[PDB]
């Protein structure tokens, strides 16, 4: 698994690969590693698929309940804090979940990294999963805060593509989103092999 | 530890050795392994001393209350069932076999084995660490229709053979004969024990 | 497991008067890929090839030691080694390290030097040969290869049909195996020619 | 003492435009022996949903009875039959409830969705699931999946018409792949049970496999 | 693997299945498990295939040297002694379970050799993972001094039981009949199992696979 | 963890390595050279277990030098790489195995530039570019994205700087200085050290 | 339990025309020692159901007591409803599974025989909760030694009579005594038909030791 | 490993900490703040196990803030330190123990400046200067050699820089930036970050 | 496995069961555990089949050469010493007891126990896993001055009692009587075995 | 144990503490942790006392033998290489020895660090033993290559003193040497407690 996220001048880019595995066996090449909590809130998944899917859906439930009760959409920081506290109750029981909470509330764009250990950090850019180190290299070498939308899409597409090329547990399709002030939009779903061949041309 | 109980027309004969050991050291060489649960019901303890004593005391208490409630001498089967239940319920915690032998007015003299929670009635029963060495002997010597005197002899011989071979057994032989008339104890000291091939 | 440390898949297929041998081209340590053109299939004659899958270091050692023995064997006796004889040579070589074996499961594919009769076999790490009349697979995705071969393999296939069969078997088999891929090389061994092709494969 | 046992078996589901197939072998194994040659792995949930379960047979029996009870409970409180998708989502939570003493079952749901199209949901033991077009689970799943990728998904093929999968062709594919899996996987054999789910209802079929 | 042997009125009959597996996957659907030791002595192998194969080849090679020097037919007892002395040397590390059967000057003989070096001379035996099924058949129907055809039938049934009851065994049934006169190696005496007749079909054309590069070398 | 990196160009091989010699939590040396000159046009970068690295590298160096003295001409990069692999492979199953990771860079008159990758299990692989250690995980993808087969040496140095800068900001280890060398047809040339 | 003490070996079960036959030896083993050689491992549940148990005898006695009370409890009602063979098999399956899920199993492998509404029932229930039904069954060592003989006869003659099934069962017992080291040559043969449950024994199998002179 | 450091002066307490948030071999954050404001004149620096640090620190912070809301006045540094120790000690033998190392710095009107040291086993100790992590091993002796009880705040910053510079060249970890704060009678003041 | 050897004025009586086991499966139900080392010297094998067979063959070979060198029938003590040396030398590797019984012209019929390298001469000896159950029986039944016929009966009974109790013992009873005249074998099949209390 | 060594303009300074321990028990406060191999060659010891004493004495023997044979004093680099190779033959057998080889040959002053693992490094300054981290702090903060002899003695005295103050396994007396072109000279043997009290005054 490779997932990344970075904030630039025109919002937040979120990109993931779609490979799931069981040992050396590729169980799926089309798994969805982004949950859509609401129109301006997203969550990435990496680690144990059952843990990620279950806890991120439970966060979505609480976010929806938060909205109904307080009559407003939960902030990115509060949503990430909710998840952080939820998984801290099972610390040490071998949960495996590394996720990013991306959205856009009243304090502009927001990106948080949350993991099963209880780590919770706000930042400008993050990468998780087994192919994260490879993604960091590409992302960091081509990141500029004044990147244009098309340029930001390319960087995201490149970072993930290269991670799938080197990391055995990453691959399939790159799914990318773009968090904007009026909500997120799904950018593309490009097969990483199509991309890689064109990059080597 | 070697324990034995034999059935005979009219009652039972229970017997055991008197050795309590702690590794290679004899902590008690004259211990009585035969405990009375009721007026006409006895039990032979084997395995862990603390466990056997804890269970026997528990059963005696339960049977005592039972006896008074029903206003009638308890059945030997009831005593065995009371022991079986305790032994089965705490099978992972306890490590002792409480052999059950006695006499009641319903089914005469009965011998029950309650090792590990399992309950079975037999003509004669042997238990403890020294019982393994006398399995062949009791199988070849036991004959149906044995009289009380013959049962005590059979019991004495078997236990004596086990005591000489088993390091965890030894000392004297405690003997008990239960019948309608009552309970009659007997102790066979070291010098009066049956002699066999000890060479 | 030591056999999956570097990954890799090798398979041999029998056709009508022709043999096919294919393998993946990935060389990686655990989850990390290092190169995408690691040689796993080595020539042991004009129409004799050996495919090796398993620990990369042992793949290279065994290949080199086998070459050493084959060269000497082909200098001593003045003739090209027969496919069956090579199998025994390899089995003997693998059995020598019975209690400290080379981590590699070889597959041999070729045609008899004088009769041009198709021959394929596979050996386990300690050297237990297994001659078949259809196909032999070896590697981290052997189960996937079995499925593909079992349903795709047909008797008496011609050079073109055999190529398509083994290509489809390998391609689809390595796509379900995370540590096998990065290209596929296929060798088609015929009486008068050898055709080497690199397939268009997934590089993830 | 181990509370699990591997009882073998393979399950496959295929989704079509107006149908769903769920098939499995009938061998029940333990160690190197056969318990019985007549133990199918597909259960009927509703009139348009079937579940294939493989793995530890103890958990397969218990899980199918728990799902059957939850279907009735849902019907009693909602006055409708659970849809294939709702069953999939509920199964996920049931499997995750035992996340620290997990059911050793590989589930594959096959049925029709609300629009009447074939649907297939695949599951891992702790509940992670997704909708697929075709999926193989259990003992010989790694032998069957690649063939399905090439024959149904048309992977690795050039200049090939991607014609929609007919029921007829789907049935021949299922029988073929199970025959091939019976040759290689020791746990797969005896007989093949195929359940076809269409709008007319569910019809079963049984094809013999190798007994050895 | 299911292997068995039995002594009949005029000789011995060996039998075995033809399935070789890797853990729980069939690798070979037709492997020969009845190895040649000498002209009138054969051996069935179970356990580690590589060990059984190398051990019997070694025993056969050593028996040949002995026969060449003595100029006489090899005794079955010489073979079992050579095998057990070798196996005992390796202390069971050489996983070879053998069933040696042959007819020498002293008559028909059958032995069961184990990995640690122990041996058993018996009228009928069985080894392998399907050894219990085959033994069951033997115990129920074996009679002393059976006719050649009656023995074959029994042996076939014994092997058959292992093929259908044991997951480790399968395929065909191989038999080997040895008497004072000749030896009949019946590779594939019965084929109780086979695959389907193929309901559907799938094929590729002469360009279904995208090729990146090509190199043709004429010979 | 130690860092090694190699980039092969049309007619040159550029290599670099960290200069940190560490003892538990302290850096005992900050100018440590992990490169060993085997010949006029061959460099051997070796990292790994303490002791083993220098022992194996010097053992190889001595034999390569001996080869040149015995025959007059030097061993080619390819031959030297295989000689190294063979030696490392032979000790793998022996009582004293060398736990070292290597990069063999060299230039041959007829074969051209070459860069070899060798892990501790003696698996030999030729490559256009390679890296060793934990730093390779964060730099290999950067090489993948910018490396081209016709890359000029001036551009290669720029590419190497990108990798080194990535380590500076992303890697948890303190590797402030790297040795930089280049091998072409004129031999081994020392380049300005890249420091931060 | 965690560690079974006294255990019983194989249990055989064969379905026949109008009934089910079940056999088991009367031995209670303590390790490799034949301690209790006269214990019954077959229990009559009700008029149409019988049960044979292998494994820990104490657990078998506990199940017998719990099953016996259930049959009694239901009989007190006298409402015309009685547990069928299938219902007993289902209950046992649930009981074993629940215990297995609490990591405190009942160390037994049971065979359920029964006859209700002109239909014979033969079910298997192990300690892990694994349950199924077939034409013939054999627990423990019987699966490798007796099951193959039963299946061989059922492959050629799917439906056999009471006599044929009885003769077949006796043939298996003899083989079990020969090859099973935890077996004893004193068994019981339980038969369930429309008339009810009948338990015969103690029986013995005629053994042949002609191979000793060979 | 995380680095914490405290230096108490005549009427002020100077504290600093690294800003690295690491995940295995990569630095996920380089501006991480390990200081938690408990009150107007109290700072709590906490390092250690992921999750535990923030959970324990925020738990303490909430109770200290609650105390001020319930009574009007704030808790003194000494009282806050003992409150923290008590809480950490109570969980030590419980099912969920906090694996955190702390430095509690604060200023009291009548008691003056104070710096407390607390390890994961809840042993509380008052000290003129202290440090936490692997960096303390290379910096504690520097503090020993230059620290004087009447050290001025300007000189204390110089002393802290010496310690930070020592880590830069001797420590194997990459800790390029540190948060620097000071607590006197006018409250908590943020100082320019010390970076390299 | 249960083995036994008894001395009598003029020779010895050696006997054993015929069960070879592999866990719970009987791999050989008619195995002969009595092996002849020399014309008048026999040995009863117990423990590991491979080890016992390896040692017996080794001893037979050594004794054969010894016999030819000295041109005289070997002594029973020599055979026991040859076995004792092998058993002691490889005590950490071997796991089998080779009971030694025979007859020579110097010391008549002698029975030697060579378990674990230790050598001792006894009037009668019992070994194997089933010997533990008959210790009491042999101690109470053995009487000095037993005739050959009485020794065979004693041996038969003891082994039969052990076979019925021990799971590792069973099958038939192999019997051998050694005396000056020669060696006379005898096999007691399942149906002709002595019957005792089997209830 | 704390030992240090640094090269400055006027030669090489070598300093050590004198504590030996067995568990928490102080076995000695007067152990000698510098071997004098010859007039211009010294070796420090830290780690296992029996290993250090034995192998450093064996190096001394070889150095003396080297002199007799080649008719010249062995160089610092060759002496350190000898020790390095000697202890590399027992790698993995749990030897414990961390030493510094200091001297002055034809290539000026020389300082090498050699340990039981086979590490061998040339350098300007080094510190070994359990109190090495503390010594490094002091030494590095006060080191200048143009230090005067008296200043170099002070730095050495300070580094060791402070290490004994913080490190429980260090203490006793500081023994210091000064390697010069014409050979080494023993500077002092000051009790660390006397020093520490004066430093706190």
Swiss-Prot record, chains A, J:
One of its GO terms (cellular component) is spermatoproteasome complex. Autocleaved. The resulting N-terminal Thr residue of the mature subunit is responsible for the nucleophile proteolytic activity. The keyword Cell division does not apply. Induction: Up-regulated by interferon gamma (at protein level). It is found in: Cytoplasm; Nucleus. GO terms for biological process: fat cell differentiation; immune system process; proteasome-mediated ubiquitin-dependent protein catabolic process. Keywords: Cytoplasm, Differentiation, Hydrolase, Immunity, Nucleus, Protease, Proteasome, Threonine protease, Zymogen. It comes from the Eukaryota. The active site is at 1 (nucleophile). Its EC number is 3.4.25.1. It catalyses: Cleavage of peptide bonds with very broad specificity. Its main location: cytoplasm. One of its GO terms (molecular function) is endopeptidase activity. The 26S proteasome consists of a 20S proteasome core and two 19S regulatory subunits. The 20S proteasome core is composed of 28 subunits that are arranged in four stacked rings, resulting in a barrel-shaped structure. The two end rings are each formed by seven alpha subunits, and the two central rings are each formed by seven beta subunits. The catalytic chamber with the active sites is on the inside of the barrel. Component of the immunoproteasome, where it displaces the equivalent housekeeping subunit PSMB5. Belongs to the peptidase T1B family. The proteasome is a multicatalytic proteinase complex which is characterized by its ability to cleave peptides with Arg, Phe, Tyr, Leu, and Glu adjacent to the leaving group at neutral or slightly basic pH. The proteasome has an ATP-dependent proteolytic activity. This subunit is involved in antigen processing to generate class I binding peptides. May participate in the generation of spliced peptides resulting from the ligation of two separate proteasomal cleavage products that are not contiguous in the parental protein. Required for adipocyte differentiation. This is Proteasome subunit beta type-8. The lineage of its organism: Eukaryota, Metazoa, Chordata, Craniata, Vertebrata. The chain holds residues 73 to 273 of 276 of the full protein.
């Amino acid at each position: 698994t490779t997932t990344l996220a970075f904030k630039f001048q025109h919002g937040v880019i979120v990109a993931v690969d779609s490979r799931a595995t069981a040992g050396n066996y590729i169980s799926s090449s089309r798994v969805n590693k982004v949950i859509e909590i609401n129109p301006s809130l997203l969550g990435t998944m990496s680690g144990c698929a059952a843990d990620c899917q279950y806890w991120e859906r439970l966060l979505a439930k609480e976010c929806r309940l938060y909205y109904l009760r307080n009559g407003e959409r939960i902030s990115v920081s509060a949503a990430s804090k909710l998840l952080s506290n939820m998984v801290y109750q099972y610390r040490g029981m071998d949960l495996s979940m590394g996720s990013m909470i991306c959205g856009w509330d009243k304090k502009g764009p927001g990106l948080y990294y949350v993991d099963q250990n209880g780590t919770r950090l706000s930042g400008n850019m993050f990468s998780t999963g087994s192919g994260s180190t490879y993604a960091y290299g590409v992302m960091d070498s081509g990141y500029q805060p004044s990147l244009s939308p098309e340029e930001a899409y390319e960087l995201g597409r490149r970072a993930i593509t290269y991670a799938t090329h080197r990391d055995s547990y990453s691959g399939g399709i790159i799914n990318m989103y773009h968090m904007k002030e009026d909500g997120w939009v799904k950018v593309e779903s490009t097969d990483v092999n199509e991309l890689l061949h064109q990059y080597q041309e | 530890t070697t324990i034995m109980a034999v059935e005979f027309d009219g009652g039972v004969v229970v017997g055991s050795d008197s050795r309590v050991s702690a590794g290679e050291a004899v902590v008690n060489r004259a211990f009585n392994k035969l405990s009375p649960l009721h007026q006409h019901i006895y039990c032979a303890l084997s395995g862990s001393a603390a466990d056997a004593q804890a269970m026997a005391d528990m059963a005696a208490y339960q049977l005592e209350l039972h006896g008074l409630e029903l206003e009638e001498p308890p059945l030997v089967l009831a005593a065995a069932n009371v022991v079986r239940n305790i032994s089965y319920k705490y099978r992972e915690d306890l490590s002792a076999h409480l052999m059950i032998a006695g006499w009641d007015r319903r089914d005469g003299g009965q011998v029950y084995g309650t090792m590990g929670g399992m309950l079975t009635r037999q003509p004669f029963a042997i238990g403890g660490s020294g019982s393994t060495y006398i399995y062949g002997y009791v199988d070849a010597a036991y004959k149906p229709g044995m009289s009380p005197e013959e049962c005590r002899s059979f019991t004495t011989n078997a236990i004596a053979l086990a005591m000489n071979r088993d390091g965890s057994s030894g000392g004297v032989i405690h003997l008990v004969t239960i019948t309608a008339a009552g309970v009659d104890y007997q102790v066979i000291l070291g010098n009066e024990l049956p002699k066999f091939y000890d060479e | 497991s030591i056999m999956s440390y570097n990954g890799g898949a090798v398979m041999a297929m029998k056709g009508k008067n022709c043999v096919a041998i294919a393998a993946d081209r990935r060389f990686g340590i655990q989850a990390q890929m290092v190169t995408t053109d690691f040689q796993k299939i080595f020539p042991m004659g004009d129409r004799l090839y050996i495919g090796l899958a398993g620990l990369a270091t042992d793949v290279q050692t065994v290949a080199q030691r086998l070459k050493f023995r084959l060269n000497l064997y082909e200098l001593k006796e003045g003739r090209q080694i027969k496919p069956y004889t090579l199998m025994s040579m390899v089995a003997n070589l693998l059995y020598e390290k019975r209690f400290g074996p080379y981590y590699t499961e070889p597959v041999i594919a070729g045609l008899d030097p004088k009769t041009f009769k198709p021959f394929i076999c596979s050996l386990d790490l300690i050297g237990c040969p297994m001659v078949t009349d259809d196909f032999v697979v070896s590697g981290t995705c052997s189960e996937q290869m079995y499925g593909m071969c079992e349903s795709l393999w047909e008797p008496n296939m011609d050079p073109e049909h055999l190529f398509e069969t083994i290509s489809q078997a390998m391609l689809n088999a390595v796509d379900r195996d995370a540590v096998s891929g990065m290209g596929v090389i296929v060798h088609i061994i015929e009486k008068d020619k050898i055709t080497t092709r690199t397939l268009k494969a997934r590089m993830d | 003492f181990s509370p699990y046992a591997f009882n073998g078996g393979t399950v496959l589901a295929i989704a079509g435009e107006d149908f769903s197939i769920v098939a499995s072998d009938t061998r029940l194994s333990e160690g190197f022996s056969i318990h019985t040659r007549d133990s199918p792995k597909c259960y009927k949930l509703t009139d348009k949903t079937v579940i294939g379960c493989s793995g530890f047979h103890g958990d397969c029996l218990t899980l199918t009875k728990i799902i059957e009870a939850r279907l009735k409970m849902y019907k009693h409180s909602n006055n409708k039959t659970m849809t294939t998708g709702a069953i999939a989502a509920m199964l996920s939570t049931i499997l995750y409830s035992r996340r620290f003493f997990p059911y050793y079952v590989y589930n594959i749901i096959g049925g029709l969705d609300e629009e009447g199209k074939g649907a297939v949901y695949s599951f891992d033991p702790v509940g992670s699931y997704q909708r697929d077009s075709f999926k193989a689970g259990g003992s010989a799943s790694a032998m069957l999946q690649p063939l399905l990728d090439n024959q149904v998904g048309f992977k690795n093929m050039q200049n090939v018409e991607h014609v929609p999968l007919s029921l007829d062709r789907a049935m021949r594919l299922v029988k073929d792949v199970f025959i091939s899996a019976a040759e290689r996987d020791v746990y797969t054999g005896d007989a093949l049970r195929i359940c076809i789910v269409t709008k007319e209802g569910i019809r079963e079929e049984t094809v013999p496999l190798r007994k050895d | 693997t299911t292997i068995a042997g039995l002594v009949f009125r005029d000789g011995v009959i060996l039998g075995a299945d033809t399935r070789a597996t890797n853990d729980s996957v069939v690798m070979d659907k037709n492997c020969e498990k009845i190895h040649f030791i000498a002209p009138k002595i054969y051996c069935c192998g179970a356990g580690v295939a590589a060990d059984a194969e190398m051990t019997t080849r070694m025993a056969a090679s050593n028996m040949e040297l002995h026969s060449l020097s003595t100029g006489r037919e090899p005794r079955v007892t010489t073979v079992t002694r050579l095998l057990r002395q070798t196996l005992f040397r390796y202390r069971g590390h050489v996983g070879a379970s053998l069933l040696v059967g042959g007819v020498d000057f002293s008559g028909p003989q059958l032995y069961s050799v184990h990995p640690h070096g122990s041996y058993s001379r018996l009228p009928f035996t069985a080894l392998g993972s399907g050894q219990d099924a085959a033994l069951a058949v033997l115990e129920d129907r074996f009679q002393p001094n059976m006719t050649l055809e009656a023995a074959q039938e029994l042996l076939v049934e014994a092997i058959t039981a292992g093929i259908l009851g044991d997951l480790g065994s399968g395929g065909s049934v191989d038999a080997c009949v040895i008497t004072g006169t000749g030896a009949k190696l019946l590779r594939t005496l019965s084929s109780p199992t086979k695959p389907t007749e193929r309901p559907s079909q799938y094929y590729f054309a002469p360009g279904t696979t995208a090729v990146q590069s090509q190199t043709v070398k004429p010979l | 963890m130690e860092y090694l990196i190699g980039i092969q160009g049309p007619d040159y091989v550029l290599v670099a390595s960290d200069q940190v010699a560490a003892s538990s939590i302290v850096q005992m040396k900050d100018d440590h050279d992990k490169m060993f000159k085997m010949s006029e046009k061959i460099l051997l970068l070796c990292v790994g277990e303490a002791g083993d690295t220098v022992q194996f590298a010097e053992y190889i160096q001595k034999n390569v030098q001996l080869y040149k003295m015995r025959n007059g001409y030097e061993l080619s990069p390819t031959a030297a790489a295989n000689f190294t692999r063979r030696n490392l492979a032979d000790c793998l199953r022996s009582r004293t195995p060398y736990h070292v990771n290597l990069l063999l860079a060299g230039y041959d008159e007829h074969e051209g530039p070459a860069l070899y990758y060798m892990d501790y299990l003696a698996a030999l692989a030729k490559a256009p570019f390679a890296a060793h250690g934990y730093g390779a995980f964060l730099t290999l993808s950067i090489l993948d994205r910018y490396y081209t087969p016709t890359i000029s040496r001036e551009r290669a140095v720029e590419l190497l700087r990108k990798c080194l800068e990535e380590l500076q900001k992303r890697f948890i280890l303190n590797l402030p200085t790297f040795s930089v060398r280049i091998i072409d047809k004129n031999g081994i040339h020392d380049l300005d050290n890249i420091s931060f | 339990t965690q560690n079974p003490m006294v255990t019983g070996t194989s249990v055989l079960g064969v379905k026949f025309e109008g009934g089910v036959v079940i056999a088991a030896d009367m031995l209670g083993s303590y390790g490799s020692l034949a301690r209790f050689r006269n214990i019954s491992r077959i229990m009559r549940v009700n008029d149409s159901t019988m049960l044979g148990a292998s494994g820990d005898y104490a657990d078998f006695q506990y199940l017998k007591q719990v099953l016996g009370q259930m049959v009694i409890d239901e009989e007190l009602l006298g409402d015309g409803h009685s547990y069928s063979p299938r219902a007993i098999h289902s209950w046992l399956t649930r009981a074993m599974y629940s215990r297995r899920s609490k990591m405190n199993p009942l160390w037994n492998t049971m065979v359920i025989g029964g006859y209700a509404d002109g239909e014979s029932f033969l079910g298997y229930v192990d300690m892990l909760g694994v349950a199924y039904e077939a034409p013939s069954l054999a627990t423990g060592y019987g699966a490798y030694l007796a099951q193959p003989l039963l299946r061989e006869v059922l492959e050629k003659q799917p439906v056999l009579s009471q006599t044929e099934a009885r003769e077949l069962v006796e043939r298996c017992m003899r083989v079990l005594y020969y090859r099973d080291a935890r077996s004893y040559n004193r068994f019981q043969i339980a038969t369930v038909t429309e008339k009810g449950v009948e338990i015969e024994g103690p029986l013995s199998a005629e053994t042949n030791w002609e191979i000793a002179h060979m």
